[PDB]
Amino acid sequence: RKPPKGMFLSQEDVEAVSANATAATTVLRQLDMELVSVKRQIQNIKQTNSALKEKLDGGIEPYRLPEVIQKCNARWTTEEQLLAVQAIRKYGRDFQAISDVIGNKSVVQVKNFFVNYRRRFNIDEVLQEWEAE
């Protein structure tokens, strides 16, 4: 009920080979054409690829810059809230993109910077012009 080895025989193809006398040759030949077809598609895409692979030479290494090493500080001097409200003016609710620009405040002390110095800094009023655009 099964082919003896890794040979494949089942109805749907045998009628395609028996449809006429040349069905065999016409069924393998356009398969050969569809083979060399995509093959030239390959070598084409390879050759386009190597071009911009050349465009990526050197990596970004000249544009990398040393990472800042710091320890998180408990309190605030006056500058990093002036930094903070500007950062949320450009950014809003993305906090690890604020915690980084301040840099001496890790992630979670930026969010309790959203409910205390507030109507003083008028934060929900600066939050919706990051929402307008």
Residues in contact with another protein by CB under 8 A are 1-5, 7-11, 13-14, 17-18, 24, 27-28, 31-32, 34-35, 38-39, 41-42, 45-46, 48-49, 52-53, 55-56, 59-60, 63-65, 67-68, 79, 82-83, 86-87, 90, 97, 100-103
Q: Nearest distance from residue 25's CB to another protein, in Å?
A: 9
- CA-nearest of 125, 120, 127, 122 to 98 is 127
Cβ nearer to another protein, comparing 20 with 112: 20
Token pair 């809003």 in the structure block, residue: 92
Minimum distance of another protein from residue 132's CB (angstroms): 19
| Shortest CB 100 distance to another protein, Å | 5
Min CB(32)–another protein separation in Å: 7
Token readout for 23 is 């069905």
Rounded Cα–Cα distance for residues 41 and 48 (Å): 11
Considering the complex, state which of residue 6 and residue 119 has its C-beta at the smaller distance from another protein: 6
19 versus 108: smaller Cβ distance to another protein:
19
Specify the long-range contacts of residues 125-133, CB closer than 8 Å, at least 24 apart.
126/85, 126/88, 126/89, 127/88, 127/92, 127/93, 129/89, 130/88, 130/89, 130/90, 130/91, 130/92, 131/92
Whole-angstrom Cα Rg for the chain: 33
